[model samples]
Target: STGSATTTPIDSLDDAYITPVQIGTPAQTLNLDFDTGSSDLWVFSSETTASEVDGQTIYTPSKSTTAKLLSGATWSISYGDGSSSSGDVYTDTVSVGGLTVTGQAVESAKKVSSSFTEDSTIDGLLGLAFSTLNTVSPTQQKTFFDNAKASLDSPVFTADLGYHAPGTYNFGFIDTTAYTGSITYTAVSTKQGFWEWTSTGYAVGSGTFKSTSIDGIADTGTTLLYLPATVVSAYWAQVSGAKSSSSVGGYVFPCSATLPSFTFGVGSARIVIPGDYIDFGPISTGSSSCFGGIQSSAGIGINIFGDVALKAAFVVFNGATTPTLGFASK
Candidate 1:
């Protein structure tokens, strides 16, 4: 069986991509952030105190006759951005797009960090990462994609993310109509529970691609692109009036500066990110201040090709035995 869902941008590129997900019996719909960086289908729920469930929507499992609580089980997850959630586990019917996963472990949030509570639109988060990263204690949980893969024709998913526009997340099938040219395949390193891959080289603007391999992951949950400090410095060097703002954090440049495009090498294939995408739009749209979507990996260690870079190309996250990652232009 095949399933697909639409992903809509939130605000700009710095925010998470939003998509629809249905849970429980009667299909309680929730707008969820499809996160490739982590594994845990956690959501605000009836178990959460009203104070903890601020602007976000809550998933009431009690309303669904199919909801079955898995006693003695619990889950807690924290993100790099400091957003976190923890709750008891319940077996319920969960569906994404049209693909359904029966008796999927749904973590009902009893507590949530301010970052999640403040975001009213994001009712929950669907983890697209490996099931090995799932957080349910005593018994690990499988992702919706993982649970539904057995019935799927092909264990693959394509992420067609766009900038300030609509996109599609196709499961179990590839839509050639969604992309242009050819999809350049690259081997993935899933030992770290991420779609981690290495780039053979990189280039800034029209500069020659340096044959320096850079290891990174394709993270849809992360908003901005993160690379080594030296790499980030090199890209900004070409832009006029670019500086690292201690107050603002990271690098900032004049909004009108002609930003240089960034490109990454996957073997022989070159995936170029447009110059405009590097600017990450204005920091406030009020002045010449603008944030650089490319930043230093610093404490994070590995580089992250967030939505900013991923949107530049169509991405195929293949959960095959070899686990290949394919990229193509839109």
Candidate 2:
């Protein structure tokens, strides 16, 4: 009725979190990015062109006895960064942890962008956002979470992403021992097909909490925390020698500068992100300047509480009839 899976960061900078997924009859395991920002279960497959098949694993639908072609059905997805992939559809058995979903739609990639091809760590993406965002044409498909929700003891899932260590994703029930203190609940707006919510306010380091409403999405797919330009500028202002650079791209500061911690409010609860997490490594291999983990969302349209912020808290994506999000300090 319930299951759990381990997700690990692919790079030292905690670029992305990946979990192993089993697809097909004999169970071909692939390391997939469990993205909560999108709704498409797509993978590199036999249909993909060899040129685009770098070092990633390819899913062979023909080899799976239970694989059934969804004739004429196709899917295409594009991200904010312009990276995209598209392909035909096939219904097959898909399993995550110990949770199995029969006849799950798996999009076989026919073509992928250079960004995906260059990243050899991920074989595909397992979307955990609302199924309304699915890209499959003719008939939009449900995500693995959606398909398995009914069978689960509770129609909910939790994400516990770690800094550089392996984290756990629990389905059906929340692990009370995983977090400390009671969870602060918030209503989610699935209208945008995302786990979107509003934060009470934010505080730069230990400064006074600014009481303001900040709308954002809790996205595991995104690498950094993107907030309003005003908030981002306010945080960087506290760090001496920090500047928004054009050549280096985004807010960069001297590596020796003492970074400040970031705090955001969920109801009256304050979740604090350590200063070391804000120092998102150096801008270059040996550069003296480092990139700030928190960036502006001016061009992104909507603010995103990505891994940079999520890693500091315990998040629950409650897939109830109305749907809600819960956050707790760890």
Candidate 3:
């Protein structure tokens, strides 16, 4: 088991990843996440002390002779669960192919939390969402897309989630399987530089008793779908019937029956969160129940749709060309 690894698809496994940009004359390929909320282009390195690190894919500087170390600037990321990872800054000539982006920033994670150390498939994340949040200070500034923008076809990225197949969410191109039929379109608003959507509610089950009043964002970084309590409880009411009343990790409910179909209606875009994606949300415990794709965050400033949500539709983010977002079928 690849610890939270999704067997979405063999072909998709190759394409469903954030492309790393190695800086220099000739570039190398690296898989990373295009995180919108944050900004930085960091990868794992060998200089890190093995004892201080967790379980993840680290990119050894030695592997790339062109790799360059930064001023030894370190980083520490903290999660909501008090989970964290720390590392030092480095430089490199990142490349996707013949197109090489020079003087790119990288991070060498030296420490990670139990949640991270336990996982292997999840090596590191690539933040190509926006240039404003990049870690490179104004004194020494840099953006992931700033240099690579010239090389990208149209400064566009497509998310392919083969939810029907368990783990087939490709990041580069639209998953052909998802939208064999022509997918509709909805113009993404480019107001805050975040790939956000204005949604009114979320629904489960195709019945009239759907979960409405869900205000959220389409964030690929989020791991679970957090929603309001009323919605969460009501949705679970039906989910309990499907799950065997057994919960995992104080959340997530595993059921014997069919889980409800999760969905959202954002303008003309009638977004439907795939059953498989929702099913991976939460499980039932001995006494407590978890949400399918909805959690109550109170006021965390975001209703994030992490990998689970990303695995459903072909989400697009644009900044290099212009401040806009375009949606299509995967």
Candidate 4:
């Protein structure tokens, strides 16, 4: 299924973005992606060719007056979605929206394409997740948030991902408006990669997690949650066309009625959605139709909580106090 790429226009980097660092000097500006799932920095250059990064934002470290790039140290990254980008490690004084944080580590993308050259909207993806899966590290342990965590005034951080308008993505910051004096933020389960979650309870329509159940990982790169065959079949039974003659596995059917909803809790965040997600967004497998959010990841051995699940709630990956994640109302 790696052949359907009818790319649309994308934003190019007109201005430099920033991130903090700790190794060598701490902090440097790098083009980033505001992805909801994985947490890692990527840049163009180093080992990639011009075609792989077509229309993407590319940064030239030599142009920056303050940033410093390691001549010998290089970086590499591959996403779960099969897309990858890599380059050299650079450090600079990171500044965002006039809120500057010095000494930030940034990925110097030496490899890119023109896919990001046409528009002036979002230049790159700025990962706002946790430090567990950060790519820039002395021992694979660098996070954009971790380097600047101590600099923040409070013990809490929230991503205000308001307004998804074109030409603008990250125009807001973590909200400080708290109704509660101190809301309890949960910690990440591990510090190896993006916060992986386990599904303890599940209900197609009010059904709950089995006393003894399987686990699922919370991944944002994946647009849908790939479930086990049995789980998929069980869910479809409550819906109209979760399994239709014209559809493949995980592709839910569409109807005038509201489909059954599925619920699951990750860390402290609980998310729910109608089964219609599968029918709405889909990727064609030859002549068959597969749901966008729910696909057949047979034998993958883990359920992926994609963008649909992620955007519905606020998740706090607390690498500051605890290597855990906290979920609450966004």
Candidate 4 CA-lDDT value: 0.47
Residue-wise lDDT of candidate 1 within 1-330, one digit each (tens)? Answer: 988999988675547788988998898988899998888998889998688777777789989999999999999998877778998999999888898889999999999988888888888899988999999998899998888887888999989988778899999999999888899999888899988999888899999988888899999999989988888989999998999888887899998888889998878888889887776767775877888888888888789988888989999999877788999988
**Model 2 ranges with Cα > 4 A deviation:** none
- Better TM-score candidate (3, 4): 3
Sorted on lDDT, highest at the top, how do the candidates line up? 2, 1, 3, 4
- How much RMSD separates candidate 3 from the native structure? 6.1
- For candidate 4, what is the TM-score? 0.68
TM-score to true structure, per model: 0.97, 0.99, 0.73, 0.68
Ranking of all candidate structures by their TM-score, best first: 2, 1, 3, 4
Candidate 2: Cα lDDT at 249:
73
Residue-by-residue lDDT tens digits, candidate 3, 1-330: 000112232222222234333433344444555455455566555655676446555677756667676774666555444556667776777654234556777766776666655544555666645655454432343555556655565555555545545433232234455454455444444454456555555666775535344545555555566666566565667665533223333235654435676666544455666555565422323433434455555556656655555665566555444454444434
- Predicted model with the maximum TM-score: 2
lDDT tens string, model 2, 1-330? 887999999999899988999999999898999999999999999999999999998899999999999988999999977899999999999998899999999999999999999999999999999999999999999999999999999999999999878898999999999999999999899999999999999999989999999999999999899999999999999999999998877999999999999999998898999988887878889999999999999989999999999999999999999999999999
Q: In model 2, what lDDT does residue 41 have? A: 93
Give per-residue lDDT, candidate 3, residue 242.
34
| lDDT of candidate 3 at residue 291, scale 0 to 100 | 44
Clashing pairs in 2: none
Go through the candidates in order and give each one's C-alpha lDDT: 0.88, 0.94, 0.52, 0.47
For lDDT, the strongest prediction is: 2
Clashes of each: 0, 0, 31, 53
